[PDB]
């Protein structure tokens, strides 16, 4: 029979520092055991201060990304202002919930500077369940990446250690290292790392190579 969903793979990560938000994703579209493409970056920049990462069935990821963009324009005409990162998170929860009985198989992490200018990460379940978080990783390799951020950005399980604030330089290094290790043990993760840094000046994209096996 027709099966409405397929797992196209992919992993997304967002780390939010005081003045920066880093949304990074692997760039492999994978169907079954075959690789559909080695360059399909998940990160999509919805607004100057907001980047969303969508991993799961690609058709669902593509449709949601178009719906979010159409709705950001609809709001800009209506309110004469851009949706703020928290508002984009709230709107996403409602859209995901509308298809509660036919779920969008998309894991979404929204990362951007907030109205104060502090980095904010909102993590969503497939039917919409956002919680503001300092760090979150979602996708096929979500389980492998999340614990390291807890150990180092979180400083969890650590005694007699200074809780120094995360620096943008250190954060980029953690983003690459979690992904480089993830490619080693995840069949669905590898190829390239697209990293987006949301800063007051604006989003910047950096690509780091990962194992192509």
């Amino acid at each position: 029979r027709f099966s409405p969903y397929v797992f196209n793979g992919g992993t997304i990560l967002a780390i939010a520092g005081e003045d920066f938000a880093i949304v990074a994703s692997d760039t492999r579209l994978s169907e079954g055991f075959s690789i559909h493409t080695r360059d399909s970056p998940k990160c999509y920049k919805l607004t100057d201060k907001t980047v969303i990462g969508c991993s799961g069935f690609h058709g669902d990821c593509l449709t949601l990304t178009k719906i979010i963009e159409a709705r950001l324009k609809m709001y800009k005409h209506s309110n004469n202002k851009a949706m703020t990162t928290g508002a984009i998170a709230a709107m996403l929860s409602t859209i995901l919930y509308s298809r509660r009985f036919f779920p969008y198989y998309v894991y979404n992490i929204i990362g951007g500077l907030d109205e104060e200018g502090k980095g904010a990460v909102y993590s969503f379940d497939p039917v919409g369940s956002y919680q503001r978080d300092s760090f979150k990783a979602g996708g096929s390799a979500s389980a492998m990446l999340q614990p390291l951020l807890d150990n180092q950005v979180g400083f969890k399980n650590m005694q007699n250690v200074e809780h120094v604030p995360l620096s943008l330089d250190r954060a980029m290094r953690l983003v690459k290292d979690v992904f480089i290790s993830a490619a080693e043990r995840d069949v669905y993760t590898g190829d390239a790392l697209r990293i987006c840094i949301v800063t007051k000046e604006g989003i910047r994209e950096e690509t780091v190579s990962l194992r192509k096996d």
Binding site: L96, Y97, F101, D125, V127, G128, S129, Q131
Partner: protein
């Protein structure tokens, strides 16, 4: 996960754990399972996270319109009836939510239990969730209508902490909320690990 609500002489005490789990994996340990519907109304949530968050938010919106239109804050019984009616329409469609709507109104301290199955009941003490069974035992042994306010908080903190120890899907900091005539107050949020040293000794 684990939510407990009891109405003692000095107001109603609502406390909940902070854990959300996707299957075995813990999605988060910082979840907020109490929704502040109004300054005098708090609704706790258990069961599917998405279903509870949207439906309680919908009640919160429905109540603010009722406050603006009728010029009087909604009753706890009306609030429970509204949530129960909305959930009943979607019955057999897989909605999963268990909630307690608690507030101080004209009638008095009020605590209500609303279920996705359509069960709306009122009671002095209720615990809803995976760790509800554990919370009920410790709360039931040691619940007094005449409990002192500081003592009532300690029974609530312990009941969630003991429930977290037995329940795998129950864990995280315990959020303590006091609903009184003046209005709700967030007494404190304490991580189970810190409580484990103090309570165990």
């Amino acid at each position: 996960t684990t939510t407990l609500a009891f109405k003692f002489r000095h107001g109603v005490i609502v406390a909940a754990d902070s854990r959300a789990t996707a299957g075995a994996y813990i999605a988060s340990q910082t979840v907020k399972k109490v929704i502040e519907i109004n300054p005098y109304l708090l609704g706790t949530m258990a069961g599917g996270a998405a279903d509870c968050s949207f439906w309680e938010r919908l009640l919160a919106r429905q109540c603010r319109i009722y406050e603006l239109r009728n010029k009087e804050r909604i009753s706890v019984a009306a609030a429970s009836k509204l949530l129960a009616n909305m959930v009943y329409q979607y019955k057999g469609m897989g909605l999963s939510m268990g909630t307690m709507i608690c507030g101080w109104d004209k009638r008095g301290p009020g605590l209500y239990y609303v279920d996705s199955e359509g069960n709306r009941i009122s009671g002095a003490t209720f615990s809803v969730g995976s760790g509800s069974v554990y919370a009920y035992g410790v709360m039931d042994r040691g619940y007094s209508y005449d409990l002192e306010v500081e003592q009532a908080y300690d029974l609530a903190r312990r009941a969630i902490y003991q429930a977290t120890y037995r329940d795998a899907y129950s864990g995280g900091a315990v959020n303590l909320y006091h609903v009184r005539e003046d209005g709700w107050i967030r007494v404190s949020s304490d991580n189970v690990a810190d409580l484990h040293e103090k309570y165990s000794g």
